[PDB]
Amino acid sequence: MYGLVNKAIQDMISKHHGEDTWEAIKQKAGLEDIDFFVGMEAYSDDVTYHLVGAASEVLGKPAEEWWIAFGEYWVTYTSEEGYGELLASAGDSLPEFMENLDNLHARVGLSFPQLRPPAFECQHTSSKSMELHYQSTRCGLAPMVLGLLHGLGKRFQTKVEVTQTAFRETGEDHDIFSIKYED
Ligand code: HEM
Protein backbone atom coordinates (compact mmCIF):
# COMPACT_ATOMS: atom_id res chain seq x y z
CA MET A 1 0.00 0.00 0.00
CA TYR A 2 1.14 3.59 -0.38
CA GLY A 3 3.44 4.90 2.31
CA LEU A 4 0.84 7.15 3.88
CA VAL A 5 -1.04 4.08 5.16
CA ASN A 6 2.12 2.93 6.89
CA LYS A 7 2.76 6.44 8.27
CA ALA A 8 -0.79 6.47 9.74
CA ILE A 9 -0.12 3.19 11.51
CA GLN A 10 3.19 4.48 12.88
CA ASP A 11 1.43 7.71 13.96
CA MET A 12 -1.42 5.91 15.72
CA ILE A 13 0.95 3.57 17.56
CA SER A 14 3.41 6.37 18.44
CA LYS A 15 0.64 8.66 19.66
CA HIS A 16 -1.14 6.05 21.72
CA HIS A 17 1.83 4.09 23.00
CA GLY A 18 4.91 6.27 22.62
CA GLU A 19 8.01 6.11 20.45
CA ASP A 20 9.81 3.29 22.25
CA THR A 21 6.95 0.87 21.63
CA TRP A 22 6.79 1.87 17.94
CA GLU A 23 10.45 0.91 17.52
CA ALA A 24 9.93 -2.52 19.02
CA ILE A 25 7.03 -3.09 16.63
CA LYS A 26 9.00 -1.89 13.62
CA GLN A 27 11.87 -4.24 14.53
CA LYS A 28 9.52 -7.15 15.16
CA ALA A 29 7.91 -6.35 11.76
CA GLY A 30 11.28 -6.77 10.04
CA LEU A 31 11.41 -3.06 9.16
CA GLU A 32 14.34 -1.79 11.26
CA ASP A 33 16.26 -0.59 8.16
CA ILE A 34 13.39 1.59 6.83
CA ASP A 35 14.28 4.93 8.34
CA PHE A 36 10.92 6.55 7.51
CA PHE A 37 7.90 5.84 5.27
CA VAL A 38 7.54 7.93 2.12
CA GLY A 39 3.88 8.92 1.98
CA MET A 40 3.48 9.03 -1.83
CA GLU A 41 5.53 5.93 -2.61
CA ALA A 42 4.11 2.44 -3.07
CA TYR A 43 5.21 -0.34 -0.70
CA SER A 44 4.69 -4.06 -0.73
CA ASP A 45 1.38 -4.79 1.08
CA ASP A 46 3.48 -7.14 3.30
CA VAL A 47 4.90 -4.11 5.08
CA THR A 48 1.44 -3.14 6.32
CA TYR A 49 0.32 -6.66 7.31
CA HIS A 50 3.58 -7.22 9.18
CA LEU A 51 3.23 -3.98 11.15
CA VAL A 52 -0.25 -4.94 12.22
CA GLY A 53 0.91 -8.45 13.17
CA ALA A 54 3.91 -7.10 15.07
CA ALA A 55 1.62 -4.62 16.82
CA SER A 56 -0.63 -7.50 17.94
CA GLU A 57 2.38 -9.50 19.19
CA VAL A 58 4.03 -6.61 21.01
CA LEU A 59 0.91 -5.11 22.62
CA GLY A 60 -0.95 -8.39 22.82
CA LYS A 61 -4.28 -7.49 21.26
CA PRO A 62 -5.80 -9.45 18.38
CA ALA A 63 -4.89 -8.08 14.90
CA GLU A 64 -8.55 -7.69 14.06
CA GLU A 65 -8.75 -5.20 16.90
CA TRP A 66 -5.75 -3.34 15.60
CA TRP A 67 -7.27 -3.11 12.15
CA ILE A 68 -10.49 -1.74 13.73
CA ALA A 69 -8.63 0.92 15.66
CA PHE A 70 -6.65 1.76 12.56
CA GLY A 71 -9.75 2.08 10.41
CA GLU A 72 -11.24 4.52 12.87
CA TYR A 73 -7.96 6.46 13.10
CA TRP A 74 -7.68 6.76 9.30
CA VAL A 75 -10.79 8.98 9.16
CA THR A 76 -9.10 11.56 11.42
CA TYR A 77 -5.61 11.06 9.97
CA THR A 78 -6.64 11.70 6.36
CA SER A 79 -8.66 14.77 7.45
CA GLU A 80 -5.58 16.17 9.19
CA GLU A 81 -2.73 15.29 6.84
CA GLY A 82 -3.80 16.79 3.54
CA TYR A 83 -7.16 15.21 2.58
CA GLY A 84 -9.55 17.33 4.69
CA GLU A 85 -11.18 19.06 1.69
CA LEU A 86 -11.40 15.84 -0.32
CA LEU A 87 -13.18 14.16 2.62
CA ALA A 88 -15.51 17.18 2.99
CA SER A 89 -16.32 16.98 -0.73
CA ALA A 90 -17.61 13.40 -0.34
CA GLY A 91 -20.58 14.57 1.68
CA ASP A 92 -22.11 15.37 5.00
CA SER A 93 -23.98 12.17 5.94
CA LEU A 94 -22.96 8.53 6.19
CA PRO A 95 -25.12 7.17 3.35
CA GLU A 96 -24.08 9.97 0.97
CA PHE A 97 -20.38 9.50 1.89
CA MET A 98 -20.56 5.77 1.28
CA GLU A 99 -22.26 6.35 -2.16
CA ASN A 100 -19.40 8.75 -3.01
CA LEU A 101 -16.58 6.55 -1.74
CA ASP A 102 -15.69 4.94 -5.09
CA ASN A 103 -15.53 8.44 -6.64
CA LEU A 104 -13.47 9.69 -3.69
CA HIS A 105 -10.97 6.91 -4.38
CA ALA A 106 -11.08 7.68 -8.16
CA ARG A 107 -9.99 11.22 -7.09
CA VAL A 108 -7.26 9.82 -4.82
CA GLY A 109 -6.20 7.57 -7.70
CA LEU A 110 -5.66 10.52 -10.09
CA SER A 111 -2.82 11.48 -7.65
CA PHE A 112 -1.69 7.91 -6.55
CA PRO A 113 -1.28 6.30 -9.94
CA GLN A 114 -0.72 2.77 -8.63
CA LEU A 115 -3.68 2.84 -6.24
CA ARG A 116 -5.62 -0.38 -5.68
CA PRO A 117 -8.67 1.07 -4.03
CA PRO A 118 -11.52 -0.83 -2.38
CA ALA A 119 -14.97 -0.79 -4.11
CA PHE A 120 -18.14 -0.01 -2.08
CA GLU A 121 -21.68 -0.44 -3.28
CA CYS A 122 -24.72 0.58 -1.20
CA GLN A 123 -28.11 -1.01 -1.34
CA HIS A 124 -30.40 1.18 0.72
CA THR A 125 -33.06 -0.72 2.69
CA SER A 126 -34.60 2.37 4.20
CA SER A 127 -33.72 6.04 4.78
CA LYS A 128 -31.81 4.85 7.85
CA SER A 129 -30.27 1.50 6.79
CA MET A 130 -28.38 -0.18 4.02
CA GLU A 131 -26.56 -3.26 2.95
CA LEU A 132 -22.92 -2.36 2.13
CA HIS A 133 -20.95 -4.47 -0.37
CA TYR A 134 -17.18 -4.18 0.05
CA GLN A 135 -15.02 -5.64 -2.73
CA SER A 136 -11.23 -5.72 -2.51
CA THR A 137 -8.15 -7.16 -4.22
CA ARG A 138 -6.86 -7.77 -0.66
CA CYS A 139 -7.55 -10.22 2.15
CA GLY A 140 -8.47 -9.57 5.74
CA LEU A 141 -9.46 -5.88 5.78
CA ALA A 142 -13.10 -6.23 6.81
CA PRO A 143 -12.24 -5.23 10.37
CA MET A 144 -10.55 -2.08 9.04
CA VAL A 145 -13.85 -1.37 7.28
CA LEU A 146 -15.79 -1.78 10.59
CA GLY A 147 -13.46 0.76 12.26
CA LEU A 148 -13.72 3.18 9.28
CA LEU A 149 -17.52 3.05 9.56
CA HIS A 150 -17.24 3.96 13.25
CA GLY A 151 -14.87 6.78 12.29
CA LEU A 152 -17.43 8.09 9.79
CA GLY A 153 -20.19 7.77 12.46
CA LYS A 154 -18.15 10.08 14.70
CA ARG A 155 -17.44 12.47 11.79
CA PHE A 156 -21.12 12.83 11.02
CA GLN A 157 -22.35 12.60 14.67
CA THR A 158 -24.42 9.58 13.67
CA LYS A 159 -24.99 6.35 15.60
CA VAL A 160 -23.86 3.51 13.33
CA GLU A 161 -24.79 -0.12 14.04
CA VAL A 162 -22.84 -2.49 11.78
CA THR A 163 -22.94 -6.26 11.52
CA GLN A 164 -20.99 -8.30 8.93
CA THR A 165 -23.24 -10.70 7.06
CA ALA A 166 -20.96 -12.18 4.44
CA PHE A 167 -17.28 -13.05 4.55
CA ARG A 168 -14.67 -12.83 1.67
CA GLU A 169 -12.46 -15.22 3.59
CA THR A 170 -14.96 -18.05 3.60
CA GLY A 171 -15.91 -19.00 0.07
CA GLU A 172 -18.41 -16.17 -0.25
CA ASP A 173 -18.06 -13.70 -3.03
CA HIS A 174 -17.28 -10.63 -0.93
CA ASP A 175 -17.81 -9.01 2.46
CA ILE A 176 -21.24 -7.61 3.10
CA PHE A 177 -22.39 -5.52 6.11
CA SER A 178 -25.87 -4.62 7.33
CA ILE A 179 -25.88 -1.10 8.71
CA LYS A 180 -28.41 0.97 10.62
CA TYR A 181 -27.75 4.64 11.28
CA GLU A 182 -29.51 7.55 13.02
CA ASP A 183 -28.75 11.01 14.42
C1 HEM B 1 -12.77 8.10 5.08
C2 HEM B 1 -13.40 7.05 4.55
C3 HEM B 1 -12.52 6.01 3.82
C4 HEM B 1 -12.84 4.74 3.80
C5 HEM B 1 -14.09 4.08 4.45
C6 HEM B 1 -11.78 4.08 3.03
C7 HEM B 1 -11.70 2.75 2.81
C8 HEM B 1 -10.51 2.13 2.43
C9 HEM B 1 -10.20 0.73 2.54
C10 HEM B 1 -11.13 -0.35 3.14
C11 HEM B 1 -8.97 0.51 2.07
C12 HEM B 1 -8.20 -0.85 2.10
C13 HEM B 1 -7.73 -1.35 0.71
C14 HEM B 1 -8.51 -2.50 0.11
O15 HEM B 1 -9.68 -2.75 0.52
O16 HEM B 1 -7.96 -3.13 -0.82
C17 HEM B 1 -8.43 1.81 1.63
C18 HEM B 1 -7.18 1.97 1.04
C19 HEM B 1 -6.64 3.20 0.73
N20 HEM B 1 -7.28 4.44 0.81
FE21 HEM B 1 -9.19 4.75 1.37
N22 HEM B 1 -10.85 5.03 2.55
C23 HEM B 1 -11.33 6.23 3.05
C24 HEM B 1 -10.74 7.46 2.84
C25 HEM B 1 -9.59 7.75 2.18
C26 HEM B 1 -9.00 9.09 1.95
C27 HEM B 1 -9.53 10.56 2.30
C28 HEM B 1 -7.87 8.85 1.30
C29 HEM B 1 -6.94 9.95 0.85
C30 HEM B 1 -5.67 9.63 0.70
C31 HEM B 1 -7.66 7.40 1.09
C32 HEM B 1 -6.59 6.79 0.43
C33 HEM B 1 -6.33 5.43 0.42
C34 HEM B 1 -5.08 4.85 0.10
C35 HEM B 1 -3.75 5.51 -0.34
C36 HEM B 1 -5.26 3.37 0.28
C37 HEM B 1 -4.21 2.24 0.12
C38 HEM B 1 -4.49 1.53 -1.23
C39 HEM B 1 -3.24 1.21 -2.02
O40 HEM B 1 -2.18 1.69 -1.57
O41 HEM B 1 -3.32 0.55 -3.11
N42 HEM B 1 -8.75 6.80 1.65
N43 HEM B 1 -9.39 2.70 1.86
Binding positions for heme b are 2, 74, 105, 116, 134, 136, 138
- Binding site members: 2, 74, 105, 116, 134, 136, 138
How far apart are the CA of 117 and the centre of ligand 1, in A?
6
Question: What is the stated resolution of the deposited model, in angstroms?
Answer: 1.9
Q: How far is residue 181's CA from residue 89's CA, in Å, rounded to a whole number?
A: 21
Which residues, in sequence order, are CB contacts of 15 under 8 Å at separation 6+?
Answer: none
| Secondary structure of 16-31 in HEC code, one letter for each residue | HHHHHHHHHHHHHCCC
Provide the CATH number for the domain formed by 1-183 in this structure: 3.90.1520.10
Please tell me the distance between residue 98's alpha carbon and the centre of ligand 1 in angstroms: 12
Q: Dihedral through CA 58, CA 60, CA 66, CA 70, nearest 10? A: -50
